[PDB]
Structure formats: structure tokens, C-alpha cells
Design a protein around this nucleic acid. Structure first.
Length: 1326
RNA sequence: CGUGUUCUAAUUGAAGGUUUUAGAGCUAGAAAUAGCAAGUUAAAAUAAGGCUAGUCCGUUAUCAACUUGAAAAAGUGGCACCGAGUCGGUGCUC
DNA sequence: CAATACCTCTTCAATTAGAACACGG
DNA sequence: TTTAGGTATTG
């Protein structure tokens, strides 16, 4: 006789229970435990809060990291295992010192000095070769045998930090001189293209190409010197290509299909080559000439140093940085001595202040130290060159800085190679292992290979040819690499909804194509002059149509049918076709795709070869990497010409279908012995449809399927709640709410509800890049003209201006950067139709009156001027298809009366699909009973509501919601949603299809919805009491019921249950604190004394536990008795559970009482004394446990007082509210008295409270809007949970935390329900 | 069907940061002190660590209590009424 | 004791897959 | 992107 309404949010879940007259019931419960009480009475409405659920994204980037860090450790491992024999010969302990290089001299086992043991020599190496990049030049240059331990020393370093694989190819650093290389291209292109000849013109190609200027520009700067060549003309692309780019010369050679080329991209050498043959072999020389330049320029940025001396440029550059520090370090210090020597300690000796002494020795970034000395360099004179260097960002470089990593790995490998070649003569073992050693630097598992697991990884999927250990060297052979690649993908791709078991067919499969075609053809009607009835296409006719027309054309069209087949074959001079649009919707595209590739039409037609064409496409869809693609294209390799095969690889396919293969031809109807495809071709008489067939009872197809949906019988609840497409947090809530219902029903005597009413409610650097790119494609200097910062664009009217590129969207005029305030944000589509605050639906222009009518999308006039302008933006990606299409819409017709009706509806019916399964799951769990007909006995209605019913209802009925006062409102919001949705479908059963779950003309529809919520009101002239005119049933009573709502709303006691959740996650703050004398510090590794070595700190605690036990005090070690809290940290927790006592004793607690220990999750609740209540938060601290049941009038009063966004109300009413603000303006004192009395009673943090009071007291003069909003601010001290910062108008009130758990220890412990209804109460004295 | 954004799940890379150690500091001066020279680099751990010993796994999800289960998860607590500062009383069942 | 006041690893690359949602045709 | 438990500091 009751109904349950619930609110499901990210962090909260609101529930309620309602009588037959919208009252809320009031039951007396039991209370297990030792306390005197044996029952308590509580209301039937409330909210269960919790911590927001957390996504796996951080954890995965952890998962990734750990797999990542160790592999790098492994590379440093293979060098040693290569080296071990020859290193012991040379040195016994070199490797041992390195492993133990970290340990303290006292704990050091071998000689402290890693490289040579001796103190004297190590000093020597460090001063001939002071930075490891001084050593890296030597052994790529020197032709004199060198100490092996220096050689390994070089090698690991490159391997440990190796360079990025963004670019894959081979680099011959014979490319140092760009001018020479470029000039050589001018030559070979002239020879190729005698008719139009370039002139080199003495461009500082090295100078032009070399420069930092943006990549697109340089090719422009180069073509600005040429005497009159087009940018996109053949030369231009080539030039553009060497600089990393993906130009296109398809337009100069008019290839039918676009021919796009990146040197960097893996698919280049063939790609040009696959292309190159097609333009003649002659050019091929031209591109290589281009690559050779690319190599010389490509590396240009890492070193501008003359190539000619050095075969190891990148490292040589670092030597350069070192020298350019030294003399600028002498000259700075020297200059400071020359002027302002007095302030010289701060700059160098003192770490703290960002001084150079800070820079080397303190936590001072390169950007933190460059902006410290900026005044000083300026303030000083004679430093002018110095200033120039800094502005360049070159002032005092360090060898490791954030940027490196635009160093490709192929010079780090360019330099590994030079060393081995250099010294393999001295040492035979290198030539034996040069390949291995290079392969260590070279080798990266691909993504599709996955973790090299052996059956123990939830994550990995690869499969093994040989079970021997995998080493970079043996890799291809051990891993079933291709097969593994098909495994990568076949776990993230779909299964048929109809058939769970069969994995979905790829999109470009011929069979889907013979299915789509034969299906769209099944309902073609045709008529001619002679016939009585227009009739279906016959089986003979369809096959004839598919074979002739479709197999001959990509697209088959209506008059292709009329004249090509009927006239040609059936000779109907003229015909009428009912079935189709201008052309058939499907096409036999894949059939056509192939015909071009292999040119054997009968082959495609032949049935026997048909499983090849699906295992061609399943392999062509399935794979990304062209080398990978080849492997399974060998299996069918024998038949085709070699020339085709090369062609075959290129046309890769994408996307996947929804239909399987046993469906389309998989299953056979028993009586008729035909599969759907069979059915589709040749259903005699009526031509049944896929949909039809799947519901033809006469047919077995529905029946057979029936088993398929059933198999596995669904899955248990979280197994299902964790597969719904949505927020991780939202799913957590979805679960929690059902755990509420099964109680609320359990509570209501296991009596199922009449109605269950559900609601759900609804980047800093992202803005920077999108603009960054957009201007670049646009090429405007507007970004240059005015620059801005990454922290600035959370303000739209600023941010919008940039996407619009400083021009009026509706006006074609430039914009005032400074006075954005005068201008107006305009939402393209009016808010009344839809509520959109997105960058997608907003625009900024001076006046929002130039778009057009208030009541429509921007006017035809607006589109005409700037439709074109809107294209530059879309291409720039400065706007979007959603943003664009609406903007251009008016030429599509402005929103039709049909459109408007649609928006007004969607405000009220929830079409959000995440809120659907949730609705569905309730129905399924709730209604299990089955009637004699297959039909379902729906005994609980489910209802989904949009927020706007309830949110508006408070606005129009004096039920205002102030979130800030209390956590209560999340619970009122079920109640309202309960009675709203119950009373709705008691007046309009017709809407039950829309509002409840289970199976032009618009203008009126607009009316029907807009006024739907009228009936509650007395005047809009409505009768007080509502009814169903059909059933003679009462639904509403304006007088009695409204009063009831107020009675429910202001109820003093609501159930508010912070979920007790055990803490999880990282053990402690990731930061590694320096060695300290603290027992707080945690030893980073099991041997490493943090007093000695440094450690972590700040461990989080998965749950605390009360030990009532004894410890010894004093020399006597007398055993006293304690009862304290011991938090068990998350490193510790695993250890605890194996045995607590042994673990507990270890801490030193003695004669621990085994039975007494009680696990306490974070957020546990104790009520001590006055009814002041507290939630555990950490072992040492507790949280505000109390809620404020503010009498409503104060709740109502404030909402108006804050006066949010001024007033949105209808004008006459606004007068009505105001007097009451100041009739009851004295209420403000009442509120403070309400906080003031309560704060004294429960919050119990007086030291602050006087402080708070005073702020209000001296601000009595200030207006209510000011004072009024702020009092709302002041609620923050009050609120359930943990202290945070807050202020009155300018006065900031710091928090007061609760610093020990002692006061809990002889107090009540409350273990409540998932609802707060059932409790068990524990008086802690013992 | 086409397209596009957004968000989620997985995999495979790069660059910094941090932490002890190694880069013979000197000149005075009994000393705290005070004069100047030096600084740019490397090694190593990078969740403690687990057994299934992999170039594997190690921060998501799920969690009142009590009886019971390995775990999953099943089982446990009268009703009415009048009233309201976090549930208080009444009558009834019991 | 419990009042104040500081601290909290970061920023980039590449590849697949699928909902969900909103424009067009 | 800011909270809200851990840390040692000062009165």
C-alpha cells in the first residue's frame, strides 16, 4: 500500500516511502546490542551517502608503469649477462659496486668508489670526462682501445634512457650539411623536370630549414625565395616532406585515389614504392634524394654543431651545453662580483631562494630559476648578451631537462653502433654480440603482443609457439605474434545480440553485403500496365538483379532497374517501382573493392572461394600494421599474382557489424530447411524480411534464438551492474540503491511496492591545444598578436573569443578583447527548447539580438553572411558538427513546430539510456511472477523521471532546496519524486508507456507537455481536487496534501548513513622524504634504514581496530592496561589478517584481549553523551557526525535571500516574495541563533564560534543579499563530515579538526543498516 | 547508413622529478666562525614486496552488524494512532 | 595537551575496442 | 583539479 521513490546520484542516493495519502510512514524498530535501549522509532525516508566511486585510469597508468619500469631494469640486465665473463677478467666487482652504489659507506660492502675502487683514479675520470656526454663523444670518435668498464658505462646509459620510437627508419648521419644536400635535390628535380626548372637561389636552406620556426612556415619561407612555384606543386610537397610532414602530391599526378606520404610513418617505403611504380621508377631516385636531406635536417634540431668533426652529434651537443654554462657561470658570478657583489650569498650559497645554489642544489626548475634572476639580469648592466640567451631559453642549461625525449632513439642507437664498431677489434665478444646489444636498444614489444605472460595475467592475451623464456633476440619465434595480434582485438569486439555465442562479422564482409543487398531487395514492389496487383520481385528476378546490376556497379539506381533489366530483359516499355529511393541503400562494395584488386570476376562469383573472401576481410579488417597484415596473406598467397598481393595489402578495412555468420546463413529453419540468406533470396509468395523472419512463429528462427538469449540465465547482479556503459561512480550508486530497495521491501514485511520512482541527475589544458591547433590551420597571427595562458580559459567570454578567432560570429567584425563584458554569450538553440551551456551551443557576439528571433535558431540573415566563415572554423576544428549543423540550420528550415515540441518533451521524459537499465533491472528483480499467458504480471511499477519535474516543482510550490544547509535534501528529493510520479500516472494511464517501464500535429503536442504540471495549481482557475475522469479515482487534494508535504519535509529526523567503506590504495604519499630521525618515515626498501637512507611517510589506513590490551611502562616494564585505537595501514593490512595477535604483539601490545578487537572502517559512527555524534576518519581523528534540521522557513528564507542570479521569476510574483524577506528580515538573527545553539550543543568547536558570531554582528549594516548569501557560507562549519575552510564576507574562518580518538573509547558504537533503519548499538565500557 | 564529438577498458613507449652514494674543496684559525674556489654529470630503487618464478603480478570494483559459508551470497528484527529539535508517547499484538 | 601552518610525483607518445549521444542524408 | 588525513611548528 506504499510506494518508493529514489534519487540516484554520483555520491548520494536518496530514498523515501509514501502512504496512500502521500504521508511518509513512521515505524518502531529493534536495536541489537548491549545498550539499555531495545527499540527506537524512525521515519521511513532518508539518504545513504558514500565516497564517489573511482575509475581505473590512474591504477592502469600505475599498472602500465610497473610493467614499464622493470623492463627498463631488464635492459640494464642483459648488458651485464653479455658482459659477465669479460668483465670479471677485467674487474671482479665492477658490477657489484654498481648494484650497491646506493648504499651508505658504513653499509657498503665493496670499495665505495664505483668505477675503479681507488679514490684517485675515479677523480681523474670525472675531470677529463665530467659529464657522461663528454664520454659519449669520445668512444664514438676515439680510435684507441679503452677500459671496458668505461665502455659498458657508456652503453647502459643510452639503453637506460634511449629515445622515442615516434620515428622509425634508419638514419645515415652523412646529412650534416643541409645546403649541400638540398642543392643536390634541386639538381635531380631539374633533371627529371627539365621543362620547368628550379633555381637554387642560394637559400640558406640550412638557415631556412634549420630554424625553430614552425614547420609549415619553413616550407613557406623556402618557397618565398623560389622564383614562382606553387606551394602544393610537386616541389613544395617534397620539401615539406623532409621536414616531418604528410604532404600530398596526389593532385599533381591526378591519381584516382589519394596518395599520402610521411617519411616517419611505418608504411612509407612500400607506400611510395607501391605508389612509385605507378608513376614510373624514374622518380624513385628523387625521393631518396629527399630522404637523404630529411636525415640531415631531421636531426638538425638536436645539434646545430658542425657535423663534419663529429660522428656523434647528439652527444656533442650536450658538451656544448656544458661549455655554455661554464663561461656564463664565470661571467655571471664575475658580473655579480663586478656589480652588486653584496647580494651574492642569496644567489649562490643559499638554496632556499631560487638562487643558482638553489638551481643545482635546491628544488628549482629551469623555469623557476629563470624567472628569479629575471629582475637581476635586467637590474644589472653589461649582461646584455646574457639576457639574450635567457630569453632564448638557453641561459644555464642542465644535461637532463624535461624536453629531451624529442631525441629519437636512432641516434642513441646511432651512438651505440659507433662504439661497437669502434672497439670490437679490441674485444672479440662485441662482434659476437653487437647484434644482441643493438637489439636490446632496438626492441619493443608491440601493443597487440601484450604482456609476455604465462597464464597468470588477467590482462595479457598472447599465445606461445615455444615455451622457452623470451628474450629480445628470440622474440618473433617464441610469441605467436600474428595470432597474438588477432587475440588483442578479438576480445574487445562484439558478439551478436541475437546470438551471444557468435562473434560479430566484420563490416566489409561480402556476406553482410549479400545480406544487406538481398534484404533491401526483398520488399521491392513493381507494377506494369498489364497486372492486376503490383507484385513482389521473384526469386529468379532478385538473383538476376544482384548478379547483373550489383555485380556490375558500385551503386544501383532506380532507372538502372527500369531500363537495364526490365526493358532489356523483361521489356516493359515503362515501369513503376514502389520499393525504393533514388538508389538502393546498400551496395556490393566489398565485391567491387576486390574486383579492382584481383581482376578475376568469375573467381568472386565462384562459391568455393567464398570462405577465403571472409577470411580475407576478417584479416583485413582485423589488422593495422602492414608488415603484420602480410603474414596471413601468405596463406592465400599462392593463387594470386605477386603484383596483386602488393596491391592487396593496401586496402585495409575498418569497423565491425552487429550480425554474426550463423544468423545470416548460420541457422536453418527445420520445417523449411532454409537459412535467412536462403530465405532472403527466394521467399516465394510474400517476401519476408529479416525482422519478419526473426518473428515468424511458423519459422523456427525466433524459437531457436530464444535459447540463445537464455543461455547462461543472465548473470548475478554486480556481474551485470559492472557491464553497463556509464560512469564508474554512477554504477556504484546504482548498486547501492537496489541494496536499499531489497531492504525497504524487506522492511515492509516483504510486501512489494505499488510504485518505484527513480531519478538520476546529470580540461584546463584542453582549451589551450584546441586553439593552438586551430589558429595554425587557419594560420592567423591573432594568437601571436595577443598571447594568453593555460589557466585563463575557464571564463568562456574570454575562451569563446579565441575559437571565434576574435571576430563576431554573427557580424563579420573584429572583437574587443578587453570589454568582453559589454558583449553577450548567445546559445545557438534557445534554452527554453533545450538547456545547453556547452561550448557546442554557445556563441559570443556583441549583441544577442543580431542572431534573429528569440524564438528560433539563428536567422537566415545570419547564415548568409557568415555560413562561409563557419567553414574555416570547422576545418580548424575551432567548432564542431553539432556546433556547425545547428548554426547552419536555418537554411534547413528553422526548427519546425515539430522540432519545438520535441525539445519541450525531452525536458520531462528521461531518454538517458543509462537510466534505463537501472529502470529495467528493478522491474526484472521486482516482478518475477508469471501469468498463464507468456505475459508478465507487473506488480511493481517502475518510473524514470527527469530532474526538471522535481526541481521546478519546488520553485513553483515554495519547496525551495538549499543544498548547503544539510545533507537532508538529497532525501526530500525522493519524496517529491515519489508523489510526483505516483500521482502523474494515477491521472494519465495513457502516458504509462512513456513514463513507466515495460511493454502540424506537433503544435498541440507542444501544448500537451508544456502545461502538463498545471493541475497541482489553483490558478495558472482550477478546481482544488483532481481526479481521473475515467476511473472516478481521486488523485489529488490541493489543501490536505500540500500540507502533508510540508509536514514530511520539515521532519526533524532523517536517516543519513555515511557508508562505512574500507580504505584502499597506495600505501603512502608517493614522495620520498629525506633521511630524518623519525619513526614516522617508512623504509622504501626492506634493507634501507630511513634514518640512514630516507623514506616515505603518511601511510593511509584501510581500517582501524580497537585493542584493549596492556603495554609496559618504565624500566620496571610494569604492565598497565590501555584501551586505544591502532590504525592498520594498507601495507600492514595484508599482514594483519594472517594473524592479528602475532602482528599486534609485534607492535608490543601485551596480553591483548582476543575477543574484544573490533574492526572499524573509516566513516564509522559513535554517539557520545549529549547526542553529539562523530564519524571516525583516520586512527587519530574524528568527523562531525551531526545534521541540522533547520526549520523550513529559514530554509525557504535563505534561498530567496541569496537571490541567486538575481530573479528569474514572473514579474508580478516577485513583488509577492520580497515583503516577506523583510517582514521576516529578523529571521537572520534566528538562523544564527539556530547555528549558534546547535554549534554549541554538538559541533562543540567554540574557539571558532565566537569568531564566527562576531563577523555577522558587525555586518548587520550590509544588505541582505550580501549578508544573506554568506550566512549560507556559514553553514559549512556545521556540516556533517570533515572540517574545511570558509569565510564570511571578507573574513576567513579556518577550520577546527578533532585531533584524537580518545573520547570515543568509552562511548556508544552504532552499526546501522544500508538505510539507518536497523541498528545494533554497542556501549563501549569494559 | 554517414559523420563527429565525449567518456570508459586494455596494451605497448619516451622525458623529467625524488632518494642515499661516487665526483680528494682549499686557505687561515685552538673553535662556533669567517675568506674564496666547485656546481651542469653517473649509478641505483621507484609502491613493502607475493608464488604461480613469468621480461609475471602488486593503488579499480565489492564491504554494517549477528547466526552460517571457502568466497559468492542466503537466513534474522509486530501493527495501529496522536504528536515533532534528530524520535517522544499512547493503545493493540505480543 | 591541542592551536597554527606546510605538504600532497609530473608532463608528454602510439595502438586497438565498445557505449552513449547528437547532426545529416 | 581541490579535499582532507599526516607531518612537525610554534604559544
Amino acid at each position: 500500500k506504499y510506494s518508493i521513490g529514489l534519487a540516484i546520484g554520483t555520491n548520494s542516493v536518496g530514498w523515501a516511502v509514501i502512504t496512500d495519502e502521500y504521508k511518509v510512514p513512521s515505524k518502531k524498530f529493534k536495536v541489537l546490542g548491549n545498550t539499555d535501549r531495545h527499540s527506537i522509532k524512525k521515519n521511513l525516508i532518508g539518504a545513504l551517502l558514500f565516497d564517489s566511486g573511482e575509475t581505473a585510469e590512474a591504477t592502469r597508468l600505475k599498472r602500465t608503469a610497473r610493467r614499464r619500469y622493470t623492463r627498463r631494469k631488464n635492459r640494464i640486465c642483459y648488458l651485464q649477462e653479455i658482459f659477465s665473463n669479460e668483465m670479471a677478467k677485467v674487474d671482479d666487482s665492477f658490477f657489484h659496486r654498481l648494484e650497491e652504489s646506493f648504499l651508505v659507506e658504513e653499509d657498503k660492502k665493496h670499495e665505495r668508489h664505483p668505477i675503479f675502487g681507488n679514490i684517485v683514479d675515479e677523480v681523474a675520470y670525472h675531470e677529463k670526462y665530467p659529464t657522461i656526454y663528454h664520454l659519449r663523444k669520445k668512444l664514438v670518435d676515439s680510435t684507441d682501445k679503452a677500459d671496458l668498464r668505461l665502455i659498458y658505462l657508456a652503453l647502459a646509459h643510452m639503453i637506460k634512457f634511449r629515445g622515442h620510437f615516434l620515428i622509425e627508419g634508419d638514419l645515415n648521419p652523412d646529412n650534416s650539411d643541409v645546403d649541400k644536400l638540398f642543392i643536390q635535390l634541386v639538381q635531380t628535380y631539374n633533371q627529371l623536370f627539365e621543362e620547368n626548372p628550379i633555381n637554387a637561389s642560394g637559400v640558406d636552406a640550412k638557415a631556412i630549414l634549420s630554424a625553430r620556426l614552425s614547420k609549415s612556415r619553413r616550407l613557406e619561407n623556402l618557397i618565398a625565395q623560389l622564383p614562382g612555384e606553387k606551394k602544393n606543386g610537386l616541389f613544395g610537397n617534397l620539401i615539406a616532406l623532409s621536414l616531418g610532414l604528410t604532404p600530398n602530391f596526389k593532385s599533381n599526378f591526378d591519381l584516382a585515389e589519394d596518395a599520402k606520404l610521411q617519411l616517419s610513418k611505418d608504411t612509407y617505403d612500400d607506400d611510395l614504392d607501391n605508389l612509385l611504380a605507378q608513376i614510373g621508377d624514374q622518380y624513385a631516385d628523387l625521393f631518396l634524394a629527399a630522404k637523404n636531406l630529411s636525415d640531415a635536417i631531421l636531426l638538425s634540431d638536436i645539434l646545430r654543431v658542425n657535423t663534419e668533426i663529429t660522428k656523434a652529434p647528439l652527444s656533442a651537443s650536450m658538451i656544448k651545453r656544458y661549455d655554455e654554462h661554464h663561461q656564463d657561470l664565470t661571467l655571471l658570478k664575475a658580473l655579480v662580483r663586478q656589480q652588486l657583489p653584496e647580494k651574492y650569498k642569496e644567489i649562490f650559497f643559499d638554496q632556499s631562494k631560487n638562487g643558482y645554489a638553489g638551481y643545482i642544489d635546491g628544488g628549482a626548475s629551469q623555469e623557476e630559476f629563470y624567472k628569479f634572476i629575471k629582475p637581476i639580469l635586467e637590474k644589472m648592466d653589461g649582461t646584455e648578451e646574457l639576457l639574450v640567451k635567457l630569453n632564448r631559453e638557453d641561459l644555464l642549461r642542465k644535461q637532463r631537462t624535461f624536453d629531451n625525449g624529442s631525441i629519437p632513439h636512432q641516434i642513441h642507437l646511432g651512438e651505440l653502433h659507433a662504439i661497437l664498431r669502434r672497439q670490437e677489434d679490441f674485444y672479440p665478444f662485441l662482434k659476437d654480440n653487437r647484434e644482441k646489444i643493438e637489439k636490446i636498444l632496438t626492441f619493443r614489444i608491440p601493443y597487440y603482443v601484450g604482456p609476455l605472460a604465462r597464464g597468470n595475467s588477467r590482462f595479457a592475451w598472447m599465445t606461445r609457439k615455444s615455451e622457452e623464456t623470451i628474450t629480445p633476440w628470440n622474440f618473433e619465434e617464441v610469441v605467436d605474434k600474428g595470432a597474438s595480434a588477432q587475440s588483442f582485438i578479438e576480445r574487445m569486439t562484439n558478439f551478436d545480440k541475437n546470438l551471444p555465442n557468435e562473434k560479430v562479422l566484420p563490416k566489409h564482409s561480402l556476406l553482410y553485403e549479400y545480406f544487406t543487398v538481398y534484404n533491401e531487395l526483398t520488399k521491392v514492389k513493381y507494377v506494369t500496365e498489364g497486372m492486376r496487383k503490383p507484385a513482389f520481385l521473384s526469386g529468379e528476378q532478385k538473383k538476376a538483379i544482384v548478379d547483373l546490376l550489383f555485380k556490375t556497379n558500385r551503386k544501383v539506381t532506380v532507372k538502372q532497374l527500369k531500363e537495364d533489366y526490365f526493358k532489356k530483359i523483361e521489356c516493359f516499355d515503362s515501369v513503376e517501382i514502389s520499393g525504393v529511393e533514388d538508389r538502393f541503400n546498400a551496395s556490393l562494395g566489398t565485391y567491387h573493392d576486390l574486383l579492382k584488386i584481383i581482376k578475376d570476376k568469375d573467381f568472386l562469383d565462384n562459391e568455393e572461394n567464398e570462405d577465403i573472401l571472409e577470411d580475407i576481410v576478417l584479416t583485413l579488417t582485423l589488422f593495422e600494421d602492414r608488415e603484420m597484415i602480410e603474414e596471413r596473406l601468405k596463406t592465400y598467397a599462392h593463387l594470386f599474382d605477386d603484383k596483386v598481393m602488393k596491391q592487396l595489402k593496401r586496402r585495409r578495412y575498418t569497423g565491425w557489424g552487429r550480425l554474426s555468420r550463423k544468423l545470416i546463413n548460420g541457422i536453418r529453419d527445420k520445417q523449411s530447411g532454409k537459412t535467412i540468406l536462403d530465405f532472403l533470396k527466394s521467399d516465394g509468395f510474400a517476401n519476408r524480411n529479416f525482422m519478419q523472419l526473426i518473428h515468424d512463429d511458423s519459422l523456427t528462427f525466433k524459437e531457436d534464438i530464444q535459447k540463445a538469449q537464455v543461455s547462461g540465465q543472465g548473470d548475478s547482479l554486480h556481474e551485470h551492474i559492472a557491464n553497463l556503459a556509464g560512469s564508474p561512480a554512477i554504477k556504484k550508486g546504482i548498486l547501492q540503491t537496489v541494496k536499499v530497495v531489497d531492504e525497504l521491501v524487506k522492511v515492509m514485511g516483504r510486501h512489494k511496492p505499488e510504485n518505484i520512482v527513480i531519478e538520476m541527475a546529470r580540461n584546463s589544458r584542453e582549451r589551450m591545444k584546441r586553439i593552438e591547433e586551430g589558429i595554425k590551420e587557419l594560420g592567423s597571427q591573432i594568437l601571436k598578436e595577443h598571447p594568453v595562458e593555460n589557466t585563463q580559459l575557464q571564463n568562456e567570454k574570454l575562451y569563446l573569443y579565441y575559437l571565434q578567432n576574435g571576430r563576431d560570429m554573427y557580424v563579420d567584425q573584429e572583437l574587443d578583447i578587453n570589454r568582453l563584458s559589454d558583449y553577450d554569450v548567445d546559445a545557438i538553440v534557445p534554452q527554453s527548447f533545450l538547456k545547453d551551456d556547452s561550448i557546442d551551443n554557445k556563441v559570443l557576439t556583441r549583441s544577442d539580438k543580431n542572431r534573429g528571433k528569440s524564438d528560433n535558431v539563428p536567422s537566415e540573415e545570419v547564415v548568409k553572411k557568415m555560413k562561409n566563415y563557419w567553414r574555416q572554423l570547422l576545418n580548424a576544428k575551432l567548432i564542431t558538427q553539432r556546433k556547425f549543423d545547428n548554426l547552419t540550420k536555418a537554411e534547413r528550415g528553422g526548427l519546425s513546430e515539430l522540432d519545438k515540441a520535441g525539445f519541450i518533451k525531452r525536458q520531462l521524459v528521461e531518454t538517458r539510456q543509462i537510466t534505463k537499465h537501472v529502470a529495467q533491472i528493478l522491474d526484472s528483480r521486482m516482478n518475477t511472477k508469471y501469468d498463464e499467458n507468456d505475459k508478465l504480471i507487473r506488480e511493481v511499477k517502475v518510473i524514470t523521471l527527469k530532474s526538471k519535474l522535481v526541481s521546478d516543482f519546488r520553485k513553483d510550490f515554495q519547496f525551495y532546496k538549499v543544498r548547503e544547509i544539510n545533507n537532508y535534501h538529497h532525501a526530500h528529493d525522493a519524496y517529491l519524486n515519489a508523489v510526483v510520479g505516483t500521482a502523474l500516472i494515477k491521472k494519465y494511464p495513457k502516458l504509462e508507456s512513456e513514463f513507466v517501464y515495460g511493454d502540424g500535429k506537433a503544435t498541440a503536442k507542444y501544448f500537451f507537455y508544456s502545461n502538463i504540471m498545471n493541475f497541482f495549481k489553483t490558478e495558472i482557475k482550477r478546481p482544488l481536487i483532481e481526479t481521473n475522469g475515467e476511473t472516478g479515482e481521486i488523485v489529488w487534494d490541493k489543501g490536505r496534501d500540500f500540507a502533508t508535504v510540508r509536514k514530511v519535509l520539515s521532519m526533524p529526523q532523517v536517516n543519513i548513513v555515511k557508508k562505512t567503506e574500507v580504505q584502499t590504495g597506495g600505501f603512502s604519499k608517493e614522495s620520498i622524504l629525506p633521511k630524518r630521525n623519525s619513526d614516522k618515515l617508512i623504509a622504501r626498501k626492506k634493507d634501507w634504514d630511513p634514518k640512514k637512507y630516507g623514506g616515505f611517510d603518511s601511510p593511509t589506513v584501510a581500517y582501524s581496530v580497537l585493542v584493549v590490551a596492556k603495554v609496559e611502562k618504565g624500566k620496571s616494564k610494569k604492565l598497565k592496561s590501555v584501551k586505544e585505537l591502532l590504525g592498520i595501514t594498507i601495507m600492514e593490512r595484508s599482514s594483519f589478517e594472517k594473524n592479528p595477535i602475532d602482528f599486534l604483539e609485534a607492535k608490543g601490545y601485551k596480553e591483548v584481549k582476543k575477543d574484544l578487537i573490533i574492526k572499524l572502517p573509516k566513516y564509522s559512527l559513535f554517539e557520545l553523551e549529549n547526542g553529539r555524534k562523530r564519524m571516525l576518519a583516520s586512527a587519530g581523528e574524528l568527523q562531525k557526525g551531526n545534521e541540522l534540521a533547520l526549520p523550513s522557513k529559514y530554509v525557504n528564507f535563505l534561498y530567496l535571500a541569496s537571490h541567486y542570479e538575481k530573479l528569474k521569476g514572473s514579474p508580478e510574483d516577485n513583488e509577492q516574495k520580497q515583503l516577506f524577506v523583510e517582514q521576516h528580515k529578523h529571521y537572520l538573527d534566528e538562523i544564527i541563533e539556530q547555528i549558534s545553539e546547535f554549534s554549541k550543543r554538538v559541533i562543540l568547536a567554540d574557539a571558532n564560534l565566537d569568531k564566527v558570531l562576531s563577523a555577522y554582528n558587525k555586518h548587520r549594516d550590509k544588505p541582505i543579499r550580501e549578508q544573506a548569501e554568506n550566512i549560507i557560507h556559514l553553514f559549512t562549519l556545521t556540516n556533517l563530515g570533515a572540517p574545511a575552510a570558509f569565510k564570511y564576507f571578507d573574513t576567513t574562518i579556518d577550520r577546527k579538526r578533532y585531533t584524537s580518538t580518545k573520547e570515543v573509547l568509552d562511548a556508544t558504537l552504532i552499526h546501522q543498516s544500508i538505510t539507518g533503519l536497523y541498528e545494533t548499538r554497542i556501549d563501549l565500557s569494559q
